[PDB]
RNA sequence: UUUGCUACAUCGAUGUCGGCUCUUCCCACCCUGGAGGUGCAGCUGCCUCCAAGGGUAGGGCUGCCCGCCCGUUAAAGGGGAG
RNA sequence: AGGCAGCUCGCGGGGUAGAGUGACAGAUCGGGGGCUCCAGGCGCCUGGGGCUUCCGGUCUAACUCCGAACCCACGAGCGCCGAAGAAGGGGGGAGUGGGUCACUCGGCGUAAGGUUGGGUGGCAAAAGGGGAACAACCCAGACCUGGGUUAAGGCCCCAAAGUCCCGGCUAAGUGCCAACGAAAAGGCGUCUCCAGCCUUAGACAGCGGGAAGGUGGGCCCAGCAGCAGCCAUCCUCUAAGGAGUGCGUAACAGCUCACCCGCCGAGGCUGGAGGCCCUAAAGAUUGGUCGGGGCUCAAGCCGGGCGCCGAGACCCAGGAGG
RNA sequence: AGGGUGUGGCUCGAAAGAAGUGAACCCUUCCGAAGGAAAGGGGCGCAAGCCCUUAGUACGAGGAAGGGCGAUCGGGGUCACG
């Protein structure tokens, strides 16, 4: 159980259960192929164990947040005036991380706090990489602790 | 189970010479010689041994170790007619009408049976001998399987008294077989 | 068939009490202490007594005493997106948390 | 013939046709093989039994012998450059 | 060679019986990796058995000179 | 009627006599056979194995057949006894309207079609229940084995043995 | 194959029973072919299995279907195709 | 300037699944003990009738001493939307009141592409890809053009890519079918796995002998001289034998059964379960199949695995519109 | 069956469209999105292949420059096959 957790959506917006076309929605998984950041907790549990069979989540490591991170563009930023503009620098922080956060002046430094949604890449080689099925238990849709990591390494 | 690695042999008789080729097997005996293929035995090694005969083959099924000794069965039994004679023996007996036979050639034929005018007639494979003495029908030859074959084809041609009559006893019949010479 | 909108239907064990507290009303305790406004109760129906019973349809909820009249008091509870009031004898009230 | 003491060549994997020899057999289709001195070196390891083809030369060896013992059994036959023979 | 100990669970409607007819089988093979496979090979295929219910208890290795089965012993 | 009419559950159970008149009255009224009490060595049962319901109409008949196995084998009150566990709690109703009315033009089809009491069952619930069980000795297996087999045989269900 | 329910299709029409003629299909074989068992001396039996190539009538009563019956024939099989 | 379609925590509600019936209400099977009455037989015994107690079992939509998962209330917290695009209030204009199906938990009814309920999802009004074609099955929500990567599926040819790998099984064209297409039983037919019993102090099988006698004891029985109807049973005995199994016979007689010896040197035998396969398994609509072609150490199945093709989903580039 | 669609073949092309102040067509150089190789090398796996390297390199949708060539293209009609 580590605070730094993330989660990528693989399955589209049709066909998607009231229960759960929201919490997407009020998880800011609009569609598949995104993601972000939260501090775990047992509160953030409850809706990943509900949205478990539409998604994959799991711990980060240093590796995927620095690649995870790195992709944010023209219109994919931070909540900078919305905007979503291309992080590209410490330029969009060094003018823009006076306003919530303290002292993060550095690109490194993104360990702590917060992000927005992200758009992402499919998954190289096919996310039936090795799978076929998108919907085995264990391998397939939820939590795959560490493994994750390489998982959006190859994103 | 599964049988791992199973061998036999044959130990060849003297006074014979065995000959073997693209596993085709033919074997000379005193008595004669006849040629039999074996080219069906997949899954089987024939190593033609100088002395004997050695047989070996490697994790057999239970199909394969059944065909195996079956194989065994036949070579011995080509053997065994090569210098002892096979003698089949068909017994005949009629209750009302005297029954007499009579070769052809290749063929036998049957007459005189229970009050039909008709012939009856079965097919002798070829290079193999039948004869009658009386009351009894000797059938010689080395193949066992050819007799056998004979022997049986007269048994059938004999058999059609079976049609809405009680069984008669009546016709040709297998006696016994193999006298040792 | 339609049920009957009897105002205690379907109730065969809503209204059964475990045997271990029948008889006339136990729980003095609860009733000897008043309610102010702003307070937060609990609403839970006595089968035994006969005197302002609520109705089924608001049992064991979540009530506000908004203020009293007479020996009764008088409840909001939130049930759909509507508000309403419940005016009742205390002896179904229990105090929340 | 497939018996111990037959040299070979491997058919598909990343050998695709170098020099082997059995030392041992393991499974109805699994045996042990090795390479003394095999120009890359052929790892002593399992071998599917189709992945082979038997040649013609044969070596004279004691049931799970050592690379070395290959190594060294080699010169008796004069296999030790007499592999590309064939 | 290192010849292997096997014996381990495998289920449809509760088949366990850890002793010899109805259970757990013999492995010849190098390592664990490779004999691992074998008992999926086979009770995978030769009796409708599903990796799921397959429960390896206890893995181990024999000596060479004492195993009660003949068959398993002259095949070197 | 045919077996296979009521073999798999349609709706609840149906038990309150009170509640349902005029049930017909089971075939089966003796339940326990042989000398109860008396020293038995072997304790084999039986077993289901999928779920249903089982017509009393049926194990009366089976009741009768291993009574005579068992009755010519030995006796009646030799060292053997024979005792069914199951009752028929269970009743069915079958909408019989289609019969007498279904060719007058009265109110036919499925018009007030609950079903009407014409038979009881031996519910069953569990996976593996027992049926019926026989206590004999050791020297009687032989002849126990095949004689709830042969019960089995009229059992509209798959049934399985054992030894004890 | 009928007969019970279903109302998914047809209400600006899919014209309704039988029979006549005519074609074809199917096999759960009536006979014809093959094989067998039998409480099969032989005939006549009885029964099982395979086998749809061919055949499987003519009359009386009843509009039919059904049904009853006449005298022969190997028997005078049963069903489908809106 | 808060709002709440979710979750967590805290704090409450519940009689359903289940379970129990000596905890009520009923249902229901038996035995034991005691008491009581009657019938029969010789005060006793037997059978039957009623009562009690003890012990055991079988069910409940309209039984509940108990009782989840679960669902719901409220507070706090998390999370999301919010002054670019706004809780509440007012106002103009509507159509909509015949739904259906799939999945899932019911009821009715056996049943039904039946009907009638709870929840979810399409479809209706949803293109695009697969399932052969297709309203509803899965993937997935089409501003446009172009490039690329991917999903559900598939990869011998039709037709894009694997005659791809390991291990094992199937002989029927079984099969090559998610939504769809065969029951009980029979099969040592085959392929793997649990028990139990004999086996080198010689196993099974196989091949000859001893395989027996007072005595064929026998009872009634002409005779049953095991085997006509009931049944016992000792030593002459020992590396072996019964007072004895099936054929039998009017009655025998006889052949065998049961046991040891002679050879024999590998397992053998009996209950158990499973996979695949065969019978069960028969309809024509007119004509033969998995889509066909066609396929049999598979182009099938099972265990697994490895590599690719595949859309408008996603990424990008350019243009367009609100 | 028909239509749009790609490749072509053959046909009409006065003006109304481009175009000699350069169409159409060839090269050469350059930039480069996402995306994304291979031979060789080494290692591992029975194999089927993967791993680091070669390298985000060659490549690339799109866009820029030069040159050489020299007058039809765009467009209409039909047909072949996908």
């Not at chain 1, 499919?122 to 994750?148: L, N, Q, T």
């Not at chain 4, 003491?5 to 699994?30: L, M, P, Q, Y």
């Not at chain 6, 060719?103 to 569990?126: C, H, N, V, W």
Request: charged share 30%; proline share 3%; aromatic share 8%.
């Amino acid at each position: 159980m580590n605070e730094l957790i993330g989660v990528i959506r693989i399955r589209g917006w049709a066909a998607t259960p009231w229960y759960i076309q929201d919490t997407l929605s009020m998880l800011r998984l609009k569609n598949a192929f995104n993601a972000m950041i939260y501090p775990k907790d047992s509160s953030i549990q409850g809706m990943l164990n509900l949205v478990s069979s539409y998604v994959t989540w799991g711990e980060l490591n240093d590796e995927g947040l620095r690649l995870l991170v790195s992709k944010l563009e023209i219109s994919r930023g931070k909540k900078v005036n919305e905007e979503y503009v291309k992080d590209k620098l410490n330029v969009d922080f060094q003018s823009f991380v006076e306003s919530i956060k303290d002292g993060k002046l550095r690109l490194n430094k993104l360990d702590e706090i917060f992000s927005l949604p992200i758009r992402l890449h499919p998954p190289k080689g096919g996310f039936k990489g090795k799978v076929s099925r998108p919907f085995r238990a264990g391998g397939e849709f939820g939590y795959r602790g560490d493994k994750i990591n390489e998982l959006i390494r190859r994103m | 189970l599964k049988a791992a690695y199973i061998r036999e042999e044959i130990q060849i008789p003297d006074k014979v010479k065995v000959s073997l080729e693209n596993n085709v097997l033919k074997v000379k005996g005193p008595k004669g010689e006849v040629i039999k293929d074996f080219s069906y035995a997949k899954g089987i090694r024939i190593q033609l041994n100088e002395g004997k005969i050695i047989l070996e083959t490697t994790f057999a099924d239970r199909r394969k170790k059944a065909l195996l000794y079956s194989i065994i069965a036949h070579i011995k039994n080509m053997i065994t007619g090569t210098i002892n004679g096979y003698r089949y023996y068909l017994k005949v007996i009629s209750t009302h009408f005297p029954i007499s036979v009579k070769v052809s050639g290749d063929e036998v034929q049957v007459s005189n049976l229970i009050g039909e005018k008709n012939i009856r007639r079965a097919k002798i494979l070829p290079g193999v001998k039948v004869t009658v003495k009386g009351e009894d029908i000797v059938v010689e030859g080395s193949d066992i399987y050819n007799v056998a074959q004979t022997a049986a084809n007269i048994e059938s041609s004999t058999k059609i008294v079976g049609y809405d009559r009680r069984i008669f006893s009546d016709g040709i019949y297998i006696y016994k077989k193999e006298v040792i010479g | 068939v339609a049920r009957s909108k009897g105002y205690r239907s379907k109730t065969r064990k809503l209204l059964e009490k475990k045997v271990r507290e029948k008889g006339a009303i136990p729980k003095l305790s609860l009733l000897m202490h008043d309610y102010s406004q702003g307070e937060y109760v609990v609403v839970k129906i006595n089968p035994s007594i006969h005197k302002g019973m609520p109705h089924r349809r608001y049992h064991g909820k979540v009530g506000l005493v908004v203020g009293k009249r007479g020996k009764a008091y008088e409840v909001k509870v939130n049930i759909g997106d509507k508000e309403r009031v419940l005016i009742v004898r205390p002896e179904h009230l229990i105090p929340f948390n | 013939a497939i018996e111990i003491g037959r040299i070979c060549v491997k058919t598909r994997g990343r050998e695709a046709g170098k020099k082997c020899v059995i030392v041992d057999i393991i499974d109805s289709n699994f045996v042990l093989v090795t390479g003394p001195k095999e120009i890359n070196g052929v790892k002593r390891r399992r071998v599917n039994i189709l992945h082979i083809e038997p040649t013609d030369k044969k070596v004279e060896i004691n049931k799970g012998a050592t690379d070395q013992e290959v190594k060294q059994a080699i010169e008796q036959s004069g296999l030790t450059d007499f592999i590309k023979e064939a | 060679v290192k010849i292997f100990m096997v014996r381990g669970t495998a289920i449809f409607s509760a088949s366990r019986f850890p002793t010899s007819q109805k259970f757990t089988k013999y492995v010849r093979a190098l390592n664990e990796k490779q004999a691992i496979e074998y008992i999926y090979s086979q009770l995978g295929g030769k009796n409708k058995i599903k990796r799921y219910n397959i429960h390896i208890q206890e893995i181990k290795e024999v000596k060479e000179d004492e195993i009660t089965d003949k068959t398993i012993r002259d095949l070197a | 009627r045919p077996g296979r009419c009521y073999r798999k559950f349609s709706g609840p159970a149906y038990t309150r006599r009170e509640y349902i008149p005029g049930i017909p009255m089971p075939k089966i009224t003796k339940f326990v056979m042989g000398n109860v009490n008396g020293d038995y060595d072997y304790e084999l049962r039986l077993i289901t194995t999928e779920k249903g319901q089982i017509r009393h109409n049926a194990l009366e008949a089976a009741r009768v057949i291993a009574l005579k196995y068992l009755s010519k084998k030995l006796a009646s009150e030799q060292n053997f006894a024979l005792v069914v566990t199951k009752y028929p709690h269970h009743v069915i109703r079958e909408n019989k309207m289609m019969a007498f009315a279904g060719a007058d033009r009265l109110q036919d089809g499925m018009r007030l079609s609950f079903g009407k009491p014409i038979g009881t069952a031996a519910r069953l619930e569990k996976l593996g229940e027992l049926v019926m069980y026989v206590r004999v000795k050791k020297e009687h297996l032989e002849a126990a084995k095949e004689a709830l087999k042969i019960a089995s045989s009229k059992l509209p269900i798959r049934t399985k043995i054992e030894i004890s």
